[PDB]
Amino acid sequence: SATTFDFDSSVFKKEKVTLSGHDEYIVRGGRNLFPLLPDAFKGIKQIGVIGWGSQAPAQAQNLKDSLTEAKSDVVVKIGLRKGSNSFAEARAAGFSEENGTLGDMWETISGSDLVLLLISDSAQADNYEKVFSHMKPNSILGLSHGFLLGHLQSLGQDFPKNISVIAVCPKGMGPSVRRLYVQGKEVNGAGINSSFAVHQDVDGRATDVALGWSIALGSPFTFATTLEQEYKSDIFGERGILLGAVHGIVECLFRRYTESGMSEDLAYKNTVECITGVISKTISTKGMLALYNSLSEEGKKDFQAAYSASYYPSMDILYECYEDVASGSEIRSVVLAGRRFYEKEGLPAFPMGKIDQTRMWKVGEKVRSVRPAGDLGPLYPFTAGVYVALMMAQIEILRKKGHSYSEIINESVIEAVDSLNPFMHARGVSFMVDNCSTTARLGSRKWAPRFDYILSQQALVAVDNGAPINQDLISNFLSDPVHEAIGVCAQLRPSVDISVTADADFVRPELRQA
């Protein structure tokens, strides 16, 4: 198999980055590159953005803003299903019928040269035939996730032969893709790193169309992957460290700390504030080694106890999750879950419920109500040990399963600290989880409890039984080749940190609060 993926661009400058001795080719972003968009989008008069979930709002606005700066005539039109209640939001964002930029999803698909299929993954699974039948012959279908390929594989099917199929997948939530891009207007751009794939190419334009799309989104750097590598790492990652695992970790630790006498206020600060504050900030620009080195000598011992006890139990669940994603089990569960959002078989509809109305999140609201701006959070050693052990276990699973370092680092490190965690610091777990896709929201709900239980049952029990510290795990962490690679990727990161607060209006409508 191939771990790395090279490509050719006649429009953009390809650059090499060496990660742990592995050369990987990438394309750096920047607003200065916007003038190249017309060349990248040759043969494209209309880009049809289908859906208005978490990705579409952001991608559509970023694309339009970029094309406007490039003085391009390419039309970005939003296509929505008939029963959609998102038309008003699209108009608020500047897409409307009077400009010819908002309409029916099928009619939009039919008139598009590039179709960005940004509807729920389960919807793609149950509606691809109609999407295919409406595509113009020789046009381009773009995905932001490889999920549909996994679903087609389960049916022994593939995409039509007469269209190109590409993907540009932002390694961060839609609200962050938009917000960072907006903050980037003051400098030479900002955004969320993206992976791209060229599954099918029927005319030779696929690579540059994908790269142009990514650059237009504001991606600081774009790296190559395949649809399969993307869905395997992605469906897994959100269930792992990005959403599911971090949620399970904070629930498990908050409970342990409060059981042990720590006040609810302090337990919240020592879990959520710690992880979303100092831990993320340090890992974002300095790395995990700098984080460990910022602990006191006694703190390193507590970190070691937590890391040593948490590493394998975390890996157990991650390993399970990854295999369920690769086998097709998880993809099928997501497809069936989407159908259960509606009544059928004489049974009720079961839309996703709220995940932040419980004890620790109610405490979180109180902590934040009186939290001053600029609070960095405490660096509680035990919490850092559990969190970093899970991050390292995820990295190891992805390496052993065959993913590139650019994919591994974005999916297990960069995304958590530069995109997601800032939302949980701002307004709790829901503000983070629920601003992600339906697939990610379902995944977080399904797997967070698994991480909570295994850490409580195994890791914490080991610590309370005086288990010896597995110093080999600690040494492995300290000498891990991923650290240098994380540093290399960090040099590609714009000097703009996402600014998001609780009353942010650039999030899903249902998540807006004031």
Ligand X SMILES: CC[C@@](C)(O)[C@@H](O)C(=O)O
SS3 category, 461: helix
Build a one-symbol-per-residue string for 182-221: x at contacts with Mn ion by CB under 5 A, - elsewhere.
----------------------------------------
Closest to 225 (Cα-Cα) out of 402, 59, 11: 402
Decide whether 436 or 473 has the Cβ nearer to ligand X: 436
What is the chain's Cα-based Rg?
Answer: 22
User: CB of 121: closest distance to ligand X in angstroms?
Assistant: 8
User: CB of 330: closest distance to ligand X in angstroms?
Assistant: 13
Q: Is 327 in the site for a second copy (CB under 8 A)?
A: yes
- DSSP-assigned states of every residue in 381-431: HHHHHHHHHHHHHHHHHHHHHT--HHHHHIIIIIHIIIIIHHHHHHHHHHH
Decide whether 167 or 429 has the Cβ nearer to a second copy: 429
Question: Rule CB under 6 A: which residues touch ligand X?
Answer: 54, 171-173, 234, 238, 242-243, 415, 436-437, 439-440
**173, interface contact from ligand X, Mn ion, a second copy, none, CB < 5-8 Å by kind:** ligand X
Closest to 237 (Cα-Cα) out of 170, 180, 304, 184: 170
> What is the 8-class DSSP label of residue 277?
I
By CB under 5 A, how many residues form the interface with Mn ion? Answer: 3
**416, interface contact from ligand X, Mn ion, a second copy, none, CB < 5-8 Å by kind:** none
**243, interface contact from Mn ion, ligand X, ligand APX, none, CB < 5-8 Å by kind:** ligand X
User: CB of 334: closest distance to a second copy in angstroms?
Assistant: 10
Residues sharing a CB contact under 8 Å with residue 226, sequence separation 6 or more, in sequence order: 5, 146, 197, 199
Decide whether 177 or 413 has the Cβ nearer to ligand APX: 177
**Is 389 labelled as part of a ligand binding site?**
no
Burial pattern 265-284, b for ≥16 Cβ within 10 A else e, equals ebbbbbbbbbbbbbbbbbbb
Amino acid (1-letter code) at residue 457: Q
Euclidean distance between CA atoms 131 and 133, whole angstroms = 6
Q: Is 283 in the site for Mn ion (CB under 5 A)?
A: no
Q: What percent of the chain is helix, strand and coil (3-state, nearest 5)? A: 60, 10, 30
Alpha-carbon torsion, ordered 393, 399, 400, 403, to 10 deg: 130
Q: How far apart are the first and last CA of the chain?
A: 50
Ramachandran area for residue 468 (φ above 0: left; ψ -120 to 50: alpha; else beta): beta
Euclidean distance between CA atoms 327 and 112, whole angstroms = 34
Q: Is 347 in the site for a second copy (CB under 8 A)?
A: yes
Build a one-symbol-per-residue string for 215-254: x at contacts with a second copy by CB under 8 A, - elsewhere.
----------------------------------------
> Is there a catalytic annotation at residue 199?
no
**Is 415 labelled as part of a ligand binding site?**
yes
Euclidean distance between CA atoms 239 and 247, whole angstroms = 10
Q: Which residues pair with 117 in a beta bridge?
A: 50
Q: Is 341 in the site for a second copy (CB under 8 A)?
A: no
Closest to 426 (Cα-Cα) out of 469, 367, 474: 367
Show contacts with Mn ion in window 407-466 (CB under 5 A). Answer: 440
Euclidean distance between CA atoms 152 and 211, whole angstroms = 25
User: CB of 118: closest distance to ligand APX in angstroms?
Assistant: 4
**Is 122 labelled as part of a ligand binding site?**
yes
Among 333, 467, 502, 511, binds a second copy (CB under 8 A): 333
**Is 53 labelled as part of a ligand binding site?**
yes
Decide whether 140 or 262 has the Cβ nearer to ligand APX: 140
Q: Is 29 in the site for a second copy (CB under 8 A)?
A: no
Euclidean distance between CA atoms 283 and 274, whole angstroms = 12
Q: Order of strands across the sheet with 102-104?
A: 15-19, 22-28, 221-224, 194-200, 164-170, 140-143, 114-117, 46-50, 75-80, 102-104
Q: Which residues pair with 347 in a beta bridge?
A: 344
Parallel, antiparallel or unpaired: strands 22-28 and 15-19: antiparallel
User: CB of 44: closest distance to ligand X in angstroms?
Assistant: 25
Among 348, 374, 466, 468, binds a second copy (CB under 8 A): 348
Q: Is 255 in the site for a second copy (CB under 8 A)?
A: yes
Closest to 422 (Cα-Cα) out of 383, 359, 372, 376: 376
Decide whether 449 or 487 has the Cβ nearer to a second copy: 449
User: CB of 112: closest distance to Mn ion in angstroms?
Assistant: 23
By CB under 8 A, how many residues form the interface with a second copy? Answer: 47
Considering the candidates 134, 145, 151, 425, report the single residue annotated as catalytic: 145
**53, interface contact from ligand X, Mn ion, ligand APX, none, CB < 5-8 Å by kind:** ligand APX
The maximal CA–CA distance of the chain, rounded, in angstroms, is 69
**Is 234 labelled as part of a ligand binding site?**
yes
Q: Is 448 in the site for a second copy (CB under 8 A)?
A: yes
Decide whether 238 or 480 has the Cβ nearer to ligand X: 238
Q: Is 453 in the site for a second copy (CB under 8 A)?
A: yes
Decide whether 80 or 473 has the Cβ nearer to ligand APX: 80
**Is 84 labelled as part of a ligand binding site?**
yes
Active site (catalytic) residues: 145
Annotated binding site for substrate: 437
Binding site for a second copy (CB under 8 A): 255, 259, 312-313, 315-316, 319-320, 323-324, 327-330, 332-333, 336-337, 340, 345-348, 350, 353-355, 357-359, 396-397, 400-401, 445-446, 448-450, 452-454, 456-458, 460-461
